[PDB]
Design a protein around this ligand. Structure first.
Ligand SMILES: [Cl-]
Ligand SMILES: [Cl-]
Ligand SMILES: [Cl-]
Ligand SMILES: [Cl-]
Ligand SMILES: [Fe+2]
Ligand SMILES: [Fe+2]
Ligand SMILES: [Fe+2]
Ligand SMILES: [Fe+2]
Ligand SMILES: [Fe+2]
Ligand SMILES: [Fe+2]
Ligand SMILES: [Fe+2]
Ligand SMILES: [Fe+2]
Ligand SMILES: [Fe+3]
Ligand SMILES: [Fe+3]
Ligand SMILES: [Fe+3]
Ligand SMILES: [Fe+3]
Ligand SMILES: [Fe+3]
Ligand SMILES: [Fe+3]
Ligand SMILES: [Fe+3]
Ligand SMILES: [Fe+3]
Ligand SMILES: [Fe+3]
Ligand SMILES: [Fe+3]
Ligand SMILES: [Fe+3]
Ligand SMILES: [Fe+3]
Ligand SMILES: [Mg+2]
Ligand SMILES: [Mg+2]
Ligand SMILES: [Mg+2]
Ligand SMILES: [Mg+2]
Lengths: 161, 159, 161, 161, 161, 159, 159, 160, 160, 160, 161, 161
């Protein structure tokens, strides 16, 4: 006749502090990447300026969408993101982007290593995230895939023969 | 050439697998129906936001039920989304009739989303073991519905 | 100021219990139709599968919009809809949809019959609705027109001439 | 050539002075509603500001399209609309909208009353319009349906249940 | 199961021969109007050519959608349309469109007359249609409203005031 | 400067050229009317595909008739697309009244498309000789209609 | 760090500034209402162009009135766009009732656009002196409306 | 096995005369675009709006056409010249008059200039067709599109 | 302070075996796209139009898939080969027959070829997943999308 | 004849002080975007959804603004710095608090931060306007757009 | 009175075997070009990577649309295309694309010559195609025009001074 | 009671001859820039061809929209533009664009200086324009901003380190 549950209060999945911290690690590197990507996008100069200028904006869009995805996933699982400038600066694992104008070739190298660093954070955190919540790991897979594609589209400028 | 030889069959789901997807399906349809009920009948403070959010929940739940039912079809299982079956087999607590306050609707719908996510989380490991590709569809459902739960329940949060 | 009314409270048109009842009847058959339409959509097999599979989704879209229209018209007029599964199952006039895979020929006949049953409810209810509120009768005309079109587009498959 | 008429001049349906008058009444209340809707849109403050601010614009859009529909229906039938400010102020049936910032709770009650007044004009006029020209009565049904929906979506904010 | 009907065959509403005949009359005049509209569209010359050239296409679009609506309403109700050239020529009530280039002033008067003739057919037929099937009468109201609007937008060109 | 001197006339078509375009025009309008007739009245196996395809044929034929009529206007010819003229001068076999089966509609409409293409192919060389630019418009019509014929007739093909 | 210390207020307009924006607002609303009146009731030679152009004028004037009213709100002023206020305080010459010829509508509407632009030009320097950002909004209004005046009045031009 | 073995295969090169023929088309299309904008701005009088709008449509077609011609030239390794001095010095179009012009006058002036542009395309047609039929198809699009514009514009002044 | 100090950080490199696994997927997706177009053109008979259209949808999914796989390979510094000779020489799909084929025959032929393509993805899945779970997620999308196409197509021939 | 004969004509160069003024605007716009996202994620309580949505609209306007300012700097050969350390070290905005915050608190906090950002633009306005009026027009768009956001947000807490 | 033809069976234009073979020649080179274009698009590396990467996808889109156009034209004229991988490999006239990564400059040269080869096929076949069916030659003109434009947009990267 | 003005004739703002001449100066340089931009767009050859080819079209679009804006502003203020080829050639201040193909690096330098020259015209004219009509100066600000952005996006190709 009926299979209906009877509780008036059914709780949702709550992330462990460890899991929250792991997604926080991903968050700050994604925001930092976005900030560095815009810096590069503004200040890149030299041969093949336009392509890099445009590709860098694609990277920024992806990293911004990613940071919102991770922060919102945290919220869904009762964890609390911190994307404030001071926290991002204090805790990001990305090497800092240099000041002033940079050459196209230099920007290609710099941004590639910074995407690599961002992806490394996600891969380092992956197995612990997957173990607690496979659905979140799928979002991580999307980030890895999208970011490694950006790294290919950007780095290929400097690859010879 | 590496070309194979002329009637290669598709992956077919075990009865148990079909049954697990059936469990997900009825709770998604029930959620969709309950969501529309809430959408129409919610009243009170912050009516508009709740009215609108609930329609988005319904869209997701309907897309989800279609995704699951069609995955069943692809793997040679047979969905049953009929009204009697859904009423008879859904695990979701019954949604009340009549007008309900926004605060009560927030609480009620959060419970019923969580019930739906619970079903998907309950079958996840057994479907993943048999067909990882289907578990990915389940992950999208878990992610999307848990997002909806957060967006809805935050209205009632204290500090 | 010349022709302005001075009432603080000007109340809206309220549906009678009979009117609310009449729209409730339309609502449950529209929802049942949507549920059966999807069942048929998923489970139809055989000759001209795709055309039928697609047409059934178009039927479902129309019935879903129809049920939302009806229910919101109820709300506008201070009536209260009930589209919950138990209610729809217990009160719909539509013949039950059979279980399992069904042939395209079978689905055509089954769905045509279910559409006609839905239209019949709207037609039975029409005059009482029109008498109380002509504006709602127009929404009923939209439903009659749209559903009878669906019936034609579906039934024509099985017509032998 | 067999069933073709041979008249050089075939004139169209012309509204009677009464019909023109009846549509004029609908027109001024629709325009007044749009003006009050915008006033409320700009000046509403307090709890749930944004929802109300947005809904009021949706109301205004519907009332503006409504007034254009009515006025052009008049023109089609050789009647002449008057939507000028002095005329609208001197002949509208709507209670005056108050000046200054108003709370969201106040705006809900005020605007619900103004919508209902507008609908009341259309409802009072309906039968005389329907008797002369059923096609125009259908446009009135669109207005009744659309405005009563607006009233429901707005008033529900203040409902305590 | 409680209120479910148990009939294998539930048939739809079937138009009487009179109803089918009445919609046939509307159909041929709509098609004739589309054909004359295009003729006028191509062959109009003189002052304010472009405005007229464009408006005539808008008229044609509406009449084409109208004829499709009518014919499909016939099909829905088990009636059979005939929109073939010989039938339209032999049975239309519209005065014949003249050959050759025609002035913008001439086209305005000619097309206004043809529109009015088309509307007259719908108006003559309306009550018999409404009596049998109110839902179809609503489609007629759409046509009356849309065509009379077209007539206004076209005739206003020649109005001297 | 290479600037010319103030009333340079446009290319004007011979009466014969206008007449040839008139021939194309009436068969395109007739096809459009016959296509709609078929669209409404077709019934039976694979109704939906045929119903939909026929509407695409009508769209093409209507766009085509407008293209030809306006080319006539551009070259100072005067189209006649009126109902009596079309009925009196079309080369297309009459389409039957009443409901027709999908199989019969496929055969009937294929014949009438082919008749329309035949007209365009019949006048092609004489229009090309006078105005190559107009023959390009004819080529688009031949291509598009012959595509329609293939898409429609394939339904009835044996093996 | 250069971070400030927790209740920094927004720029607030003087009463005079609010009043000047109020002046612009009522003339924009009046223009919108007059434009629709003209749009409906214009008849005669070149009806369609005028009918259509007048609707574009109305769109601009409505967008403009919303821009001004919301700028008032942002700067803590309170708009009054009510029918009585607009009728009582607009500087625009009354638009006549009844059908008017296209030639008369061109002249009438040009005058009333110019009246509206005149108001904005009259308050410009006093608003610019207080808040340059608001004067930019006024510039868009001057530009757009003067464009409308040109597009409308050109119909009546002699040689 | 059917594969050609040459490492570099050359594409079709246009003769310089062919390039010169397309160049004639180009300058007249650019001149027409420039005159069309002049007319679009400066037209006044009865039925102003229709003409103002129709003139912009002409300009859009003419600008798209000149891009099509110049890019066809580049495809075949010809080199277009669309610079102002070249256009002014080599266009065959009668000069457009200065100042405001009535809609009636603009209709006649622009019809003539469209007809002049079309005439250039028609004059080079056979020489272009003989060398490269694909390019002649682009000429056909231009003839068709421009003669349509001529009809749409001149119809305003037709008294029947 | 948490910032890494190395000037160049290396990204994830796929093993050559991983690249080889994705390569198997790629050739079958390309072969499937090519056979799908062959079927789309040459299908005739009852319910022609639905099949003609469904086959193009399959081709779109298969083309998008092969781009996804080839670009994932490039991301991980593998090097795809989608050239005709390689596809023909290394595809595991049964050859599609020449000439016109009936809708019934096309349904069965294409179902088999979709099933063959899916089988390749399923065969390499675990080896791909073990090295790079993110890539396995792309494999899942392909399995899901292709098996849907198989269902949508084969249903035409199902007799119940 | 009116043509200038110099082979290279220099564009307008911004003084370094001008660049510095735009830099102040930039860091506050970026800080505002970052705080806006923080608020957007962490806001809870009555009327959550409206605020959640309005905060994203603010973030979109602020991100577009910072791009506009940074690109205006580049146009005039100034060099922006939008890096996290620089933003944190040089923003004039009060720090946004950690953790979940109520909708009422978020309304007041964000209004203040919008007002701080606007104040920076208003402070540099006259110095920017004196050197380059075109840039001051961009400042006006920002003032107008941000003060609108301030009104739309703070209205939630207004008790009348 | 009537100009209507009387045959119940009117056949369509049927291509000669020679014509079918000529379009088949065009088909395989278009498919081969598409395959090579994607290979280049994936494997291009070096200065100005992105522009070439993107342009190559434009070329692929055009060649794919072209192959479908030619194959469908064949079908319209009762000819039977063969676009299978074995046939394409066995019969294409394009020099094969090399394996592995290639430099931007190398890809520009390689793809230019392969477009040149594809266009050469169409030009070689042109006159015989035109003689039998001028409408098909027009499709060939589109292919020539579109492909030679691609060749210009791609080759210009390597052109100096 | 009433604040309505009483004149039946209210004139619009009329530009001085000087102001008209100033906007004319802006106009011819914008048209010249558009003409040169297309010349460069067609004839640019070499490393990073595609980016420049595309960016040049963006510049052309902006300069075309600008020329229409200025000419229409002139018309609004009763001034009469001259954008004819002879006038543009006789009066533009831009150095002429060279003939034949030019290298990417050369085009970057050439176009940058020509944008610089166009902007210089607008800046030279600015204060006199602003003094008479601040609203027109705002349009000039848009042109300056948009053109200087183009100059940055184009020139950055040639900027080293
Ligand atoms: Cl379809
Ligand atoms: Cl919203
Ligand atoms: Cl228009
Ligand atoms: Cl790009
Ligand atoms: Fe996924
Ligand atoms: Fe997984
Ligand atoms: Fe209706
Ligand atoms: Fe009625
Ligand atoms: Fe040709
Ligand atoms: Fe200013
Ligand atoms: Fe062509
Ligand atoms: Fe501005
Ligand atoms: Fe978000
Ligand atoms: Fe589905
Ligand atoms: Fe709803
Ligand atoms: Fe209107
Ligand atoms: Fe239809
Ligand atoms: Fe047309
Ligand atoms: Fe607003
Ligand atoms: Fe271009
Ligand atoms: Fe790609
Ligand atoms: Fe940017
Ligand atoms: Fe195709
Ligand atoms: Fe313009
Ligand atoms: Mg079918
Ligand atoms: Mg809210
Ligand atoms: Mg006009
Ligand atoms: Mg590049």
């Amino acid at each position: 006749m009926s299979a209906r549950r009877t509780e008036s209060d059914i709780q949702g999945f709550h992330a462990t502090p460890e899991f929250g911290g792991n997604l926080q690690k991903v968050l700050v590197d994604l925001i930092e990447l976005s900030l560095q990507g815009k810096q590069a996008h503004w200040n890149v100069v030299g041969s093949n300026f336009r392509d890099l200028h445009l590709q860098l904006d694609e990277l920024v869009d992806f990293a911004r969408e990613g940071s919102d995805t991770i922060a919102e996933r945290m919220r869904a699982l009762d964890a609390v993101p911190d994307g404030r400038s001071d926290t991002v600066a204090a805790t990001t694992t990305l090497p800092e982007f240099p000041a002033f104008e940079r050459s196209t070739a230099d920007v290609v190298d710099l941004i590639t290593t910074r995407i690599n660093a961002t992806v490394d954070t996600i891969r380092r955190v992956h197995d612990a995230v997957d173990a607690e919540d496979p659905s979140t790991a799928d979002l991580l897979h999307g980030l890895i895939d999208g970011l490694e594609k950006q790294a290919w589209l950007i780095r290929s400028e400097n690859r010879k023969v």
